[PDB]
Amino acid sequence: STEYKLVVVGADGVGKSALTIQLIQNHFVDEYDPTIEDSYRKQVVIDGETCLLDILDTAGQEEYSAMRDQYMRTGEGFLCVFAINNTKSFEDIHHYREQIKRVKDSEDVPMVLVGNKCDLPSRTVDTKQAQDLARSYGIPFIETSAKTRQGVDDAFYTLVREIRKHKEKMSKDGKKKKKK
Ligand SMILES: Nc1nc2c(ncn2[C@@H]2O[C@H](COP(=O)(O)OP(=O)(O)CP(=O)(O)O)[C@@H](O)[C@H]2O)c(=O)[nH]1
Ligand SMILES: [Mg+2]
Ligand SMILES: [Mg+2]
């Protein structure tokens, strides 16, 4: 069945790992253990298709940009995670997207904007500005909590759906031809 290369990106401490672990292992990591680079696979059924999810869980801050370039090249789809009580992490999304587009040398890259930690009262990034940004990029926005698991499956499943749409659009192309 179809394999999907997903990459989870975002600033230090937004909950990239907690989201990924909730997805894979169904528990919430309460600790803060900074990531170098972790990879996971989960077989799931999404819209009646069996998917092999190959998930890359990236570091909050890359020491070597070459390490960032590589996962942006390999990734088929990107989970762009910010925390709703971390304004800078939300601002960092623009910079991730620019870096990904440049590396892919393309304007069309499957991504989903993820506002994590929605269980907190400390919200400094409002939903509207998140929604506005996602609308601007033409990608989905999903609010999640790794603590409660709210929205976690949805975030990953939606990314898979985005990758499918892209594959279809890339077969049909926009020009240079073609496919139906
Ligand atoms: N309240 C709440 N806390 C969360 C949530 N997700 C993660 N955390 C907490 O935030 C801290 C960092 O989470 P972690 O998943 O390691 O974030 P990360 O972005 O992977 C860290 P790095 O960028 O170094 O790899 C941990 O204390 C974790 O329990 C959430 O949805 N809600
Ligand atoms: Mg991590
Ligand atoms: Mg990062």
What is the 3-class SS of 23-62, one letter each residue? HHHCCCCCCCCCCCEEEEEEEEEECCEEEEEEEEEECCCC
| Strand 141-143 with 49-58, pairing | unpaired
**Does the beta carbon of 32 sit less than 6 angstroms from any atom of ligand 1?**
yes
State in Å: Cα 173 to ligand 2 middle: 36
Please tell me the experimental approach by which this structure was elucidated.
X-ray
Angstrom distance (rounded) from CA 179 to CA 42:
31
Question: HSE-up of 173 (CA within 13 Å, CB side)?
Answer: 5
Angstrom distance (rounded) from CA 18 to CA 165:
27
Angstrom distance (rounded) from CA 67 to CA 90:
22
Residue recorded with tokens 């077989």: 43
Q: Is 93 exposed, middle or buried (0-12, 13-18, 19+ CB in 10 A)?
A: buried
Angstrom distance (rounded) from CA 178 to CA 174:
7
What does the DSSP 8-state code read for residue 151?
T
Question: HSE-up of 139 (CA within 13 Å, CB side)?
Answer: 28
**Does the beta carbon of 17 sit less than 6 angstroms from any atom of ligand 1?**
yes
Report the DSSP beta bridge partners of residue 159: none
- Cited resolution, angstroms: 2.0
Residue of 117, 123, 125 to test ligand 1 pocket, by largest number of atoms within 8 Å of CB: 117
Angstrom distance (rounded) from CA 83 to CA 54:
23
For each of the domains in the chain, give its residue range(s) and CATH number, in order of start: 1-180 (3.40.50.300)
